[PDB]
């Protein structure tokens, strides 16, 4: 077991951020953010589009590195050990909407407000959260 | 082959950051900062001091993160793919010299003023400088 | 697999632009521009009036360089890597109007204005597009 | 046979630009650009820096398209054609020296001023600058 890299995107639009419901044996039916685990040679950047379009079909523009945050799941059924890459993108068409294209990871995408996220949250994404980061600002 | 988290640490010493030549396949003879590996279950400043502590017997303290860094090594003898946290770190007693406790990996380690940087430095570090990245006020 | 070499062809008329849905595995049903794969030797301009004839009938002249893209489609049924050149031309005959020649592959041509094009676009020319990228003023 | 992609790269270093003679059965010992064939999933960007890279060890950013020529070689041994992109980039570290890192392929590199071109240039080059295509202005 050693540490893997991820990246996790927030789409940014308007006021909102895309999240969806987990269904995994981490974190169960919390909302999270798309993401994908970055392949050998990949930057950052390209993860983020390709994980993105994976899960939602969402073409994605102006990625923004934002930081960076260790995700140790101990009590999980296999231990595991992510190094989470978050990375800001907005919709190539605004008006793009999400489609759930791997249900067997995801309930469903949907736009929530920043000032009216739902509960639970991914605890990894809770915990940022609860730092203070703000991926608009 | 799958990418591999390391950390990288500036330990900020007044003016100056510690580098030294490696002695590696990669980057050979090029001035790098102390690091190490990620293990599993470690936190990132944990794996810095621990880093510093096994490189050159310096005590550090007042770990803060930085940024990440994508660097990819695919020409390389063996293909190698590194995600690099670089974290901010203090002398814990600022006489403290540091020792070359690993010197098959590099050269020696000496302090480099923020204005008078050696040369070559090692790709990464001269690629993330050249975005203007600063340690000392990021 | 490796990088192709394809041409598509803005055709201006008026204040719009030729278009028609794919029959494709890769981006069906979306609307895209006339255009085909470079032959070993032919230029730019050559592909362009003989795909635009081939799929449309349509003869075309005053063929101009645009721009380049790369396309990726890792994903797609058969992963592909084309390499897009775009040509800008007009008609020969003003009053020309396309045929689906090669129904196959589209399910018809038809004219639409710069400022009201259809969706959903083909993926590439909507990233194009994004760019600002305009075929009537470029260069 | 095929059209295929080839990546050529214009570096800008003040006034001038890399060049190094052909040695190749293609343009034998005519002034030419670093450059490369474009790999599946590549950008033209990744392709640029990978084959400066390749070929002179320079690292290049701010890479910017320039334009596209075809480029049909039917005289040669095996009549190839080639669909070639034009890109220009910077050096990270404009005092970093090129090396003829294969040099099999090319006499050696150097830096040629825009209005002191070698002779006798590439022809698909010389070609392009005929049509009056400027690098540093396009
Ligand atoms: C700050 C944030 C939101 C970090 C994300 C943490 C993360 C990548 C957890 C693993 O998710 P996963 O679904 O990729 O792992 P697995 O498939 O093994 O359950
Ligand atoms: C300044 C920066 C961003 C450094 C990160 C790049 C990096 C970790 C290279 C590998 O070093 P290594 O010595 O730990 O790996 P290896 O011994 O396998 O070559
Ligand atoms: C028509 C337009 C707007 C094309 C833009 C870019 C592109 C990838 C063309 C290749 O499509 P193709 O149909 O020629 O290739 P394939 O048959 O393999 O899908
Ligand atoms: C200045 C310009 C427009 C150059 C493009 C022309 C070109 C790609 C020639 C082939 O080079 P190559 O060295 O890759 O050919 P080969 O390896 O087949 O000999």
Same mark, same amino acid.
């Given at each position: ?14 006021? %909102? ?7 995994? !044996? ?16 990949? %930057? ?6 390709? $994980?993105?379009? $994976? ?5 994605? $523009? ?21 190094? %989470?890459? !978050? ?7 605004? %008006?793009? $909407? ?40």
């Amino acid at each position: 077991a050693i540490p893997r890299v991820a990246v996790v995107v927030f789409i940014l639009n308007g006021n %909102s951020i895309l999240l969806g419901r987990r269904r995994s !044996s981490i974190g169960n039916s919390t909302f999270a953010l798309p993401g994908g685990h970055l392949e050998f040679g990949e %930057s950052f950047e390209e993860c983020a589009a390709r $994980e993105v379009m $994976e899960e939602t079909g969402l073409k994605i $523009e102006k990625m923004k590195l934002l930081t960076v945050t260790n995700n140790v799941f101990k009590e999980a059924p296999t231990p595991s050990h992510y190094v %989470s890459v !978050s990375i800001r993108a907005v919709l190539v068409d605004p %008006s793009q $909407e999400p489609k759930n294209m791997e249900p067997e990871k995801c309930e469903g995408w949907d736009w929530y407000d920043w000032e009216n996220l739902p509960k639970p949250l991914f605890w990894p994404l809770e915990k940022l959260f609860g730092s203070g980061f703000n991926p608009f600002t």
